[PDB]
Design a protein around this ligand. Structure first.
Ligand SMILES: [Cl-]
Ligand SMILES: [Cl-]
Ligand SMILES: [Cl-]
Ligand SMILES: [Cl-]
Ligand SMILES: [K+]
Ligand SMILES: [K+]
Ligand SMILES: [K+]
Ligand SMILES: [K+]
Lengths: 91, 94, 91, 94
């Protein structure tokens, strides 16, 4: 497998783990909700809640700038790998 | 004409069918609401609601990562291969 | 002025007018709220409401695919024009 | 080093200051909440709230169109000029 894809995967996972830890401890979310919030924030889908604490709001601002580029780089490389078998079967 | 476009089109349709079936079954949404939720999620517009079940939350996370790349790949091919040539042709004085 | 920018502007305005007309009449929104909903939908910011009618939900799905590419093309060209005087003053 | 980056950085800071001042004044938000609202709007994440005043709604529409291009231009330059070289340097065996 492509090292470039593997590194993007690792960076993404590490970034989502850090968010899950932060929001589950600081904002009192269940782990699955902390992970969900991290994911929909960094992919810009968003959701129906926001952090309650000032610490949480500051973290989220920085989290977005730290992570959005990484996540969308991963989504793009993932898309190439997911769609390529179908392209190659059709070509 | 463009086989990458054809693939991205079919994959996008299949993805939206899968979301419509999932969210109507697991989250109890009307089929039209399940399709709406799938579309606004994968285009990253977002929705006034969120999944209520843990199954729905886990599925949505995976659906987001796989689906955004496909849907926006389709949107780009649509813009380049259909909308842009249509706009250009519609600006020609005749 | 660049014709490419002028056409993107016109297309964007026409698309937002169509959304404002639709959501103000079909979904019963005030004009400013119908315009706001159209804008945050096509730029993918989103907001705290969704269409109530099935007609509205179908329109919004199609609206997104019809308009998202146009709007982001305009946002990009706008950004070039807005930032260029500052770049040229700094270079 | 990269003067386009410097411009996009300063313009992004000025934009977020303007939003923080606007939403705290016109919409009554705490400064920290006004900054948060400005950031999630211009990165297109979105927020659980929306402007309540018609002034806030009109401003936000204009803020979105001007601000998204600047903020995401900054994000791209940040990725290419800072984060990517930092990642590459941090992967070198030493
Ligand atoms: Cl959990
Ligand atoms: Cl239905
Ligand atoms: Cl009005
Ligand atoms: Cl404050
Ligand atoms: K949203
Ligand atoms: K978005
Ligand atoms: K959003
Ligand atoms: K929302």
């Amino acid at each position: 497998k492509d090292k470039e894809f593997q590194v993007l995967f690792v960076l993404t996972i590490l970034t989502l783990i850090s968010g899950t830890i932060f929001y589950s401890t600081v904002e009192g979310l269940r782990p699955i909700d902390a992970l969900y919030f991290s994911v929909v924030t960094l992919t810009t889908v968003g959701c129906d809640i926001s952090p309650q604490t000032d610490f949480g709001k500051i973290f989220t601002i920085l989290y977005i700038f730290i992570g959005i580029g990484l996540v969308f780089g991963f989504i793009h490389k993932l898309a190439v790998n997911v769609q390529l078998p179908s392209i190659l079967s059709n070509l």
